[PDB]
Coordinates of C-alpha atoms in Angstrom, one line a residue:
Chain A
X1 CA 201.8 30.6 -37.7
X2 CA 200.0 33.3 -39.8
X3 CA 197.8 31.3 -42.6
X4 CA 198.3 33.6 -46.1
X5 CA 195.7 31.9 -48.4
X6 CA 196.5 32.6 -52.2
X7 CA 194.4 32.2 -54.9
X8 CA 193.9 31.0 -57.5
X9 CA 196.5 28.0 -57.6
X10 CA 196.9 27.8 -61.5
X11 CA 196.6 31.1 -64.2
X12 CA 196.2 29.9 -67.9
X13 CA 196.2 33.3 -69.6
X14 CA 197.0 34.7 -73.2
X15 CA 200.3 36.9 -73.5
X16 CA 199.5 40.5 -73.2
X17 CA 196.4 39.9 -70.9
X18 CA 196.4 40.9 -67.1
X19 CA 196.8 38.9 -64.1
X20 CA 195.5 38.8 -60.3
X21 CA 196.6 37.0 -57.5
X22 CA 195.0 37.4 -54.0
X23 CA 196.5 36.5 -50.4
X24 CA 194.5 36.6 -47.4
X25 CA 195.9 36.8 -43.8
X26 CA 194.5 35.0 -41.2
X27 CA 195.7 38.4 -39.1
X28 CA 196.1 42.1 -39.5
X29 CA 199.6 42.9 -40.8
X30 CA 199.9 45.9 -42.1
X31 CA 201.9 46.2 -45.2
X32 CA 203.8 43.7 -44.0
X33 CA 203.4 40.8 -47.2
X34 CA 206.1 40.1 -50.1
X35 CA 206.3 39.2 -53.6
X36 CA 208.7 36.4 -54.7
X37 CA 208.5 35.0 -58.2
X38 CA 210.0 31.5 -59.0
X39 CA 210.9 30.4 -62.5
X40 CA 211.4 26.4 -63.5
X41 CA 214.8 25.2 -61.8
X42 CA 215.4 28.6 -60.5
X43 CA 215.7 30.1 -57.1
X44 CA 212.9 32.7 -55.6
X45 CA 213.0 35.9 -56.7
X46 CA 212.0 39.4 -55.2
X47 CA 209.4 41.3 -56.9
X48 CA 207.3 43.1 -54.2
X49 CA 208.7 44.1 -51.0
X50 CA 205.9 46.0 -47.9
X51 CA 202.8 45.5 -49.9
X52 CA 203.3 47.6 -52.9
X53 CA 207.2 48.8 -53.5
X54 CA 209.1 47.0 -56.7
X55 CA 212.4 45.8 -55.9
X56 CA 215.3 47.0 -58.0
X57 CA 215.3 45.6 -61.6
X58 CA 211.7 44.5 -61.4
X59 CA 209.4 45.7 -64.6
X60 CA 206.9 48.3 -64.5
X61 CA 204.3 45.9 -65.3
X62 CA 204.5 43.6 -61.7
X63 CA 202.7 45.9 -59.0
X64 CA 201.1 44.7 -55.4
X65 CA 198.5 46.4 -53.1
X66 CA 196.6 46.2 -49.7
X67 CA 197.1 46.7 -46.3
X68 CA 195.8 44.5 -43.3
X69 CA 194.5 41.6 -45.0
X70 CA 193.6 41.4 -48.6
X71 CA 197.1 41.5 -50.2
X72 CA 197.0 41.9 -54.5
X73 CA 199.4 41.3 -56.7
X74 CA 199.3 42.1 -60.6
X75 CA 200.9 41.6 -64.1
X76 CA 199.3 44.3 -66.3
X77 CA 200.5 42.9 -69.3
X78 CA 201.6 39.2 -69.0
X79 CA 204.7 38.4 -71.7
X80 CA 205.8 35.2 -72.5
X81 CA 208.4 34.9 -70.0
X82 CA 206.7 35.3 -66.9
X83 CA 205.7 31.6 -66.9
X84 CA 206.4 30.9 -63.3
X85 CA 205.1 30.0 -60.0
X86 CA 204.2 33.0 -57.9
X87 CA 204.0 33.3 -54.1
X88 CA 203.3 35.5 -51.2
X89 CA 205.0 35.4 -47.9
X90 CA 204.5 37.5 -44.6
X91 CA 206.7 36.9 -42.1
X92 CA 209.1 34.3 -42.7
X93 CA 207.8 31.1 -42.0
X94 CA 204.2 32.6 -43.5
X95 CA 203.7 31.3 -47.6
X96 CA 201.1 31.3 -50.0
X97 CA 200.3 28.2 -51.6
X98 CA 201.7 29.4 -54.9
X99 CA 200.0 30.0 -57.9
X100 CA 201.6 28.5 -61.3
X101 CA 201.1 31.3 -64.1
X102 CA 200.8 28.8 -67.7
X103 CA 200.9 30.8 -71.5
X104 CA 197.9 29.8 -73.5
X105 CA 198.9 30.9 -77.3
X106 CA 197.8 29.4 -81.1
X107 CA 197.4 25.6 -81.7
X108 CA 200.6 24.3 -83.2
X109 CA 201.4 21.4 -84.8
X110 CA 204.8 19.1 -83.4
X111 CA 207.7 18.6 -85.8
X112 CA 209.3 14.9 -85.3
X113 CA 212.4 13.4 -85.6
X114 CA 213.5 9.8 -84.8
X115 CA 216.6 8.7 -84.0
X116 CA 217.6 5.2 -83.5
X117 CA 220.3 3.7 -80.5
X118 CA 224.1 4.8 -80.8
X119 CA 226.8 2.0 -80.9
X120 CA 227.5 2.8 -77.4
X121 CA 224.7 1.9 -75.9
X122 CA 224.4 -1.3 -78.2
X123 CA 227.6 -2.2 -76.5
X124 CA 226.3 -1.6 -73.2
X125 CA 223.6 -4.4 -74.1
X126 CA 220.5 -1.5 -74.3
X127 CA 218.8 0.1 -77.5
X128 CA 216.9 2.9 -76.5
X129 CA 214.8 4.7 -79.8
X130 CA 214.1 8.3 -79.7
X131 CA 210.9 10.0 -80.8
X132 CA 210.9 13.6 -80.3
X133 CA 207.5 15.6 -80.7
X134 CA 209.0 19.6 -80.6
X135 CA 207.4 23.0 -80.3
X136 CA 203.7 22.5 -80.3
X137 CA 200.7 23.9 -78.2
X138 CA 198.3 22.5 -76.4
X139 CA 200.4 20.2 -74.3
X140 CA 198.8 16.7 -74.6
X141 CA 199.9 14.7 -77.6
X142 CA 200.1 10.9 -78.7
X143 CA 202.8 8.8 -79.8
X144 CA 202.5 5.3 -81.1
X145 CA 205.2 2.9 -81.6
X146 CA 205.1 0.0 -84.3
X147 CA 207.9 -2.3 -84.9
X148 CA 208.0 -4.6 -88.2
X149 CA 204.8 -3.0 -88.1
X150 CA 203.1 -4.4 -85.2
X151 CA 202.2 -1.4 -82.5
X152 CA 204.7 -2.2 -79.3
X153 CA 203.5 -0.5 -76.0
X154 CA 206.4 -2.2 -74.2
X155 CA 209.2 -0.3 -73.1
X156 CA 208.2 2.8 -73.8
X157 CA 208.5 6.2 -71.6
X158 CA 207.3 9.6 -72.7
X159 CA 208.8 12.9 -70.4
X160 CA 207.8 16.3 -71.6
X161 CA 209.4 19.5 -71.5
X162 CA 208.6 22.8 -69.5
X163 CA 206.5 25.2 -71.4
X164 CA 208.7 27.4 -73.4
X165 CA 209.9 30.9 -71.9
X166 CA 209.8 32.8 -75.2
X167 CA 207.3 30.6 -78.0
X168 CA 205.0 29.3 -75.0
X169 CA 205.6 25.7 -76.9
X170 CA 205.7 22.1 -75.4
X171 CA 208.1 19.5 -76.4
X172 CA 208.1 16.2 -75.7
X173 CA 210.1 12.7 -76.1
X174 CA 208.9 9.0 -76.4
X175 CA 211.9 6.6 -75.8
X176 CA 211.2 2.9 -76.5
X177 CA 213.7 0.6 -74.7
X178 CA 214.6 -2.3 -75.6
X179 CA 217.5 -5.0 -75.0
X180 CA 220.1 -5.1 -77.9
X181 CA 219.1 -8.7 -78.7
X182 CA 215.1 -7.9 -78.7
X183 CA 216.0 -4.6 -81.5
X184 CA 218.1 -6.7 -83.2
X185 CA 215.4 -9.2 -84.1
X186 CA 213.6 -6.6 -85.9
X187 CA 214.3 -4.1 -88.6
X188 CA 211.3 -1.4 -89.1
X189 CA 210.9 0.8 -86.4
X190 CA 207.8 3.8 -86.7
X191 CA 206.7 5.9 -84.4
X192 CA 203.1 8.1 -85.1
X193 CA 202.1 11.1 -83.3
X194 CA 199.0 12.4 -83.0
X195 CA 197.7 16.0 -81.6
X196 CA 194.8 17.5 -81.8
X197 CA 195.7 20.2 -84.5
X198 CA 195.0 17.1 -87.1
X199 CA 193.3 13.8 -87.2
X200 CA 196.0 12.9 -89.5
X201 CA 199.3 11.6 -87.8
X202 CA 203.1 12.6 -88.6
X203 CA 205.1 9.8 -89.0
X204 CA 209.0 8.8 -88.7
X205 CA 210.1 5.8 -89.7
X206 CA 213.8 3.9 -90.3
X207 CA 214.9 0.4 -90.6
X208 CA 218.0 -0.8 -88.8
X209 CA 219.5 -2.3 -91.5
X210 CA 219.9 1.1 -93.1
X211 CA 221.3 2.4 -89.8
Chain B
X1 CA 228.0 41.5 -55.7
X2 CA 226.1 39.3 -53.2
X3 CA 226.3 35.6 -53.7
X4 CA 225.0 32.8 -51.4
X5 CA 226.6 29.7 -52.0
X6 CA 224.9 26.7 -50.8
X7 CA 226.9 22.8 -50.9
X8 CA 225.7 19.2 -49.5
X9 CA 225.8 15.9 -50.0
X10 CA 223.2 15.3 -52.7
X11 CA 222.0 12.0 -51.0
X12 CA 221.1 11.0 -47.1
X13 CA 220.2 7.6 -46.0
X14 CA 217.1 7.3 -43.4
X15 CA 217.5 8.1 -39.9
X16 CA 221.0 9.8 -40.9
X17 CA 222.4 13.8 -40.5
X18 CA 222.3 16.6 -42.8
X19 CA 225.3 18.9 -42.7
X20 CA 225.1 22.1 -45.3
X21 CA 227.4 25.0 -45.4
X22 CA 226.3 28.3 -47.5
X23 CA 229.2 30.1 -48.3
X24 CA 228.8 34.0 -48.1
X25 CA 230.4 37.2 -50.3
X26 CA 229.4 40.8 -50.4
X27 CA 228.3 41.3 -47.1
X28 CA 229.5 40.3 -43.4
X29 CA 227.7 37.3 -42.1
X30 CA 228.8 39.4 -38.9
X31 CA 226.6 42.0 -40.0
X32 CA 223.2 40.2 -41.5
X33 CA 220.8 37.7 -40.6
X34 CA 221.1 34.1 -43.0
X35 CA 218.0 31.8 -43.1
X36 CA 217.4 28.4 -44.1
X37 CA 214.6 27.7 -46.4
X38 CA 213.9 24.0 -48.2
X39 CA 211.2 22.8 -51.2
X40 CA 210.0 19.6 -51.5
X41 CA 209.5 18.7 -55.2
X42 CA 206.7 19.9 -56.7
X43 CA 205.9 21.8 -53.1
X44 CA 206.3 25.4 -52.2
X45 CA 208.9 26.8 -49.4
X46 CA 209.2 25.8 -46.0
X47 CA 211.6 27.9 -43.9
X48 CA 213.6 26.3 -40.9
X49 CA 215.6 29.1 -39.4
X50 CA 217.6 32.1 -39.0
X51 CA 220.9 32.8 -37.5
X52 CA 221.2 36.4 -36.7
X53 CA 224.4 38.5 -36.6
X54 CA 225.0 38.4 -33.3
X55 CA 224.2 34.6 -32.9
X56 CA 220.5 34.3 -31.7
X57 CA 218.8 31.8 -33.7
X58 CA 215.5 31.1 -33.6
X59 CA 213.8 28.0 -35.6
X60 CA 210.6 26.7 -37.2
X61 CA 208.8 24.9 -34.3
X62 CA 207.8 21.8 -36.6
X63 CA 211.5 20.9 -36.7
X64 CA 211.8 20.8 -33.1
X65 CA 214.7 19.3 -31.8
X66 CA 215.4 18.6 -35.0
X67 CA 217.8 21.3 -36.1
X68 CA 221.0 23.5 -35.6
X69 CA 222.2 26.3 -37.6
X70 CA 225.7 28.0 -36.5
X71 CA 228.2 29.6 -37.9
X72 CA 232.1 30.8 -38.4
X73 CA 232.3 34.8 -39.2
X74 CA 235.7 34.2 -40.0
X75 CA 235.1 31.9 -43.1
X76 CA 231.5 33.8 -44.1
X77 CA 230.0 30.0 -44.2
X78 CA 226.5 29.8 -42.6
X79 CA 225.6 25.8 -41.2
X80 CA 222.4 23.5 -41.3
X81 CA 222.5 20.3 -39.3
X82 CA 219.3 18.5 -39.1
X83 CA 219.0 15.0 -38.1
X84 CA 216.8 12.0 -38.4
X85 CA 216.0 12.2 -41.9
X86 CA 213.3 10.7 -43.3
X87 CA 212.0 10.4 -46.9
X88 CA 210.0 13.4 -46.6
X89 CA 213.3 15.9 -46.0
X90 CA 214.0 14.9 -49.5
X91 CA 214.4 18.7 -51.0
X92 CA 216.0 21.4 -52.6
X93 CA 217.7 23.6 -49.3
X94 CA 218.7 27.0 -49.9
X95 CA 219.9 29.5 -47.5
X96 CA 218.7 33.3 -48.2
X97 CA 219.4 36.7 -47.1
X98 CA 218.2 39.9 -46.6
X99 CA 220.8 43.2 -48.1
X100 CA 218.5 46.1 -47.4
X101 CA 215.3 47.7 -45.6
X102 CA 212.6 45.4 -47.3
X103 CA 210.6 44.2 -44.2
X104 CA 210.5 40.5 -43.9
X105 CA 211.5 39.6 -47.8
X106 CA 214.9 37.7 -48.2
X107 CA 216.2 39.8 -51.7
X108 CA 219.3 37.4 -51.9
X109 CA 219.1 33.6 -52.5
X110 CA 221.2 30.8 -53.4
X111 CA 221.2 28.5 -56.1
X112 CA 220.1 25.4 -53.7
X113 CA 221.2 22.2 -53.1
X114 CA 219.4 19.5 -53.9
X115 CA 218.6 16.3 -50.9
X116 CA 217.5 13.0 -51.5
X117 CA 216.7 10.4 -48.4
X118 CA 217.1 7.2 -49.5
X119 CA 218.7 3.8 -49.0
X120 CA 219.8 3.5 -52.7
X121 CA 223.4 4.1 -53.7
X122 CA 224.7 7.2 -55.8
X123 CA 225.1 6.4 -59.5
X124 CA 226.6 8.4 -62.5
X125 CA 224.5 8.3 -65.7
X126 CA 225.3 7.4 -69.3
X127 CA 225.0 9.8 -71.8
X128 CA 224.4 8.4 -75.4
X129 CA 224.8 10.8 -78.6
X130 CA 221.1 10.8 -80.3
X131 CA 222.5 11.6 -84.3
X132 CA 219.9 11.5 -87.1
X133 CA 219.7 8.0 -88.7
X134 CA 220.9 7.8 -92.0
X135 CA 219.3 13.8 -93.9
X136 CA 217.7 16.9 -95.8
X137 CA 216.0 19.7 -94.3
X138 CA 216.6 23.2 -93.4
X139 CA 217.8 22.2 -89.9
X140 CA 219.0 19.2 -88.0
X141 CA 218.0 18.0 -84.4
X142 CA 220.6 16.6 -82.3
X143 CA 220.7 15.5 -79.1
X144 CA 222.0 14.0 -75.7
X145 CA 219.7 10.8 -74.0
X146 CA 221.0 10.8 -70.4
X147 CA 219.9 7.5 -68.4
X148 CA 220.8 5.7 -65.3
X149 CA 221.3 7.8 -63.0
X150 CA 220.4 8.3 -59.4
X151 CA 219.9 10.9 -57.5
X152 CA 218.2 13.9 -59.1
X153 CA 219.6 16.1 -60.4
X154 CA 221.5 16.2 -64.0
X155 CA 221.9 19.2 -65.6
X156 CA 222.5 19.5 -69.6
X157 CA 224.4 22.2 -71.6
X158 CA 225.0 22.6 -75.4
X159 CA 228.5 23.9 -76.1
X160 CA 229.4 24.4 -72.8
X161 CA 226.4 26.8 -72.8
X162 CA 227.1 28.8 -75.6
X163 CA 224.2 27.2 -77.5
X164 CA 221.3 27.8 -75.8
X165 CA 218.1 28.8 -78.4
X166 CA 216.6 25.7 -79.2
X167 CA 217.4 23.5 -76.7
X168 CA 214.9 21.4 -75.0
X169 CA 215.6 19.3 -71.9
X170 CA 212.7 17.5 -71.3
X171 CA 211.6 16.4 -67.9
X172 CA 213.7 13.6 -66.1
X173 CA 211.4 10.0 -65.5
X174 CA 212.1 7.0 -62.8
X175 CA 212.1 3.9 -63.6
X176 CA 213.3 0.5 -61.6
X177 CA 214.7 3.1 -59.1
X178 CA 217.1 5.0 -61.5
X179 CA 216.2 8.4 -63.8
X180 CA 216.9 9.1 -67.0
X181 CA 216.4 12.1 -69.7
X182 CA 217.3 13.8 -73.0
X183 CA 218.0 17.2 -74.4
X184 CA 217.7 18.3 -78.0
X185 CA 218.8 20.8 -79.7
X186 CA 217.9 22.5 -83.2
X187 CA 220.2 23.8 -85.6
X188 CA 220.7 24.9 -89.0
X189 CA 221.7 21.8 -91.3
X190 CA 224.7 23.4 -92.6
X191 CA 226.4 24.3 -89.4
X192 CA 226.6 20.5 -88.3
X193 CA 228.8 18.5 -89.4
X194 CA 230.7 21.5 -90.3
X195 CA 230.8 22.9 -86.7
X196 CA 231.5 20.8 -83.6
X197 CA 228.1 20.3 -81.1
X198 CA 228.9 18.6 -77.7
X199 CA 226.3 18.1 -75.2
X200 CA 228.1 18.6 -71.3
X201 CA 226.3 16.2 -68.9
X202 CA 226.9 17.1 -64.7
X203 CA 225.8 14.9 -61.9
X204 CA 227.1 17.0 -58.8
X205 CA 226.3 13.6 -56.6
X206 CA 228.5 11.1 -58.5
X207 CA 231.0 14.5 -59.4
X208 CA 230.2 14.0 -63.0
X209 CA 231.0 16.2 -65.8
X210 CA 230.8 14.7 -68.8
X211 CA 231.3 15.6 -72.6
X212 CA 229.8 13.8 -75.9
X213 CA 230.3 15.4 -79.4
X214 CA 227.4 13.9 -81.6
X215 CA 229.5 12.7 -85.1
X216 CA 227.8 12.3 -88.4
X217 CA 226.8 8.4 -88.9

């Protein structure tokens, strides 16, 4: 029971630009506050240990300062890899809220591929089709599926990727599933996707005859 | 070189225990403290408790009654036992450490183990090979479309791990109770066929480890 308020929550900011994050105890502590940085899927990480010392290993650009109650931590020069969720702490059961550092780079277009179900999972009864939308910036995009040429809504899931640690890209995939019998009573399958780099879509197409 | 060592049971039905052990080397458990630290998905850290060298433990007070953490010095293994799970205990754990004079920050930390509470049944995925249909092009994107599976988490390598730049695992998706994802991978045209590709699928609850070599239709 200290409170250690962070702010702000999200960072979108352009590689090589500099970052601040604030925390705010709710009490005096000294230099008592630490760093920890936390990457997708990966465990916490020390950067900043007593208010202002780097750890071992840690960069020149990842500072902190402040004693009492105004705690600051900074990235002088962002890079590309620092995408992560940053968080105080004070004593050990004391966190910040976190605050999710996102790469803002150049608008760029997806590359698509389709693929169409394996004979495996035909056997097991399932055909799962495969659009995948890779490497482009910002994240939202649009994917429409038509079969025989008629747009199918119906079995379809989307799932996107982490932004990337080195390009700063999204990638994405659109999987239509249907039963073997239902993709076997049709032979075009398209899908069109849509971003905001164009108002023209990229299309993908095959025909399950062919395949 | 330090490493904390966290294992568990991947799933936990309601109302029931969980027991982890975090395995220690590089330092004396008799020596340092070892805390106990959990994230809900999508949540930042909550710690639960410490057990210090000498065997004083002292515990978050929101767990009340709710925990126990012991250990054995002569195996190095660190223990969390916390009963009455419910649906919100579903987390990554980790245990964590502290090697040096750094003031409260824990320097050393496991990889975690990931806990699901829930009255569904463990269930190894299906991996299906995702192979161009029917190409030119400078470079060829393969991949790996991982589905039925419950719980989280899968993980996906490319070679065993020795292809790693331009792979893309996108995020995993539930549906009907059961998850499901894919992972892609880009590479030149020429070296595949030519070269073998396998995607390596794990599911640590089911003990999965799974290989799929993606063939030329």
């Amino acid at each position: 029971s200290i409170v250690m308020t962070q702010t702000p929550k999200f960072l979108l900011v352009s590689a090589g630009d500099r970052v601040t994050i604030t925390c705010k105890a709710s009490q005096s502590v000294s230099n008592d506050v630490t760093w920890y940085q936390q990457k997708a899927g990966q465990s916490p990480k020390l950067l900043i240990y007593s208010a202002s010392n780097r750890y071992s290993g840690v960069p020149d650009r990842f500072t902190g300062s402040g004693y009492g109650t105004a705690f600051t931590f900074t990235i002088s020069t962002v890079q590309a890899e620092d995408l992560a969720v940053y968080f105080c702490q004070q004593d050990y059961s004391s966190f910040g809220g976190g605050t999710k550092l996102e790469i803002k780079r150049a608008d760029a277009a997806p590359t698509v591929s389709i693929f169409p179900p394996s004979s495996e999972q035909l056997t097991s009864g399932g055909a799962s089709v495969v659009c995948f939308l890779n490497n482009f910036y910002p994240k939202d995009i649009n994917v429409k599926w038509k079969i025989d040429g008629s747009e199918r809504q119906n079995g379809v899931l989307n799932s996107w990727t982490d932004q990337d640690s080195k390009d700063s890209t999204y990638s994405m995939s659109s999987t239509l599933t249907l039963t073997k019998d239902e993709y076997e009573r049709h032979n075009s399958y398209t899908c069109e996707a849509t971003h905001k780099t164009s108002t023209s879509p990229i299309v993908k197409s095959f025909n399950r005859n062919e395949c | 070189q330090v490493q904390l060592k966290e294992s568990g049971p991947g799933l936990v039905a309601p109302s029931q225990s969980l027991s982890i052990t975090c395995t220690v080397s590089g330092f004396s458990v008799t020596n340092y403290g070892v805390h106990w630290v959990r994230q809900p998905p999508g949540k930042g850290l909550e710690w639960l408790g410490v057990i210090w060298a000498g065997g004083i433990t002292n515990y978050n007070s929101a767990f009340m009654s709710r925990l126990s953490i012991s250990k054995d010095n002569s195996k190095s293994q660190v223990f969390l036992k916390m009963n009455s799970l419910q649906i919100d205990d579903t987390a990554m754990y980790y245990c964590a450490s502290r090697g040096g004079h750094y003031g409260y920050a824990l320097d050393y930390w496991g990889q975690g183990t990931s806990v699901t509470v829930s009255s569904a049944s463990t269930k190894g995925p299906s991996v299906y090979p995702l192979v161009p249909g029917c190409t030119s092009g400078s470079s060829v994107t393969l991949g790996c479309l991982v589905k039925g599976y419950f719980p989280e988490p899968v993980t996906v390598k490319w070679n065993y791990g020795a292809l790693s730049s331009g792979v893309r695992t996108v995020s995993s998706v539930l549906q009907s109770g059961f998850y499901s994802l894919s992972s892609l991978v880009t590479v030149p045209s020429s070296t595949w066929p030519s070269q073998t590709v396998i995607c390596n699928v794990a599911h640590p609850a089911s003990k999965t480890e799974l290989i799929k070599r993606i063939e030329p239709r």
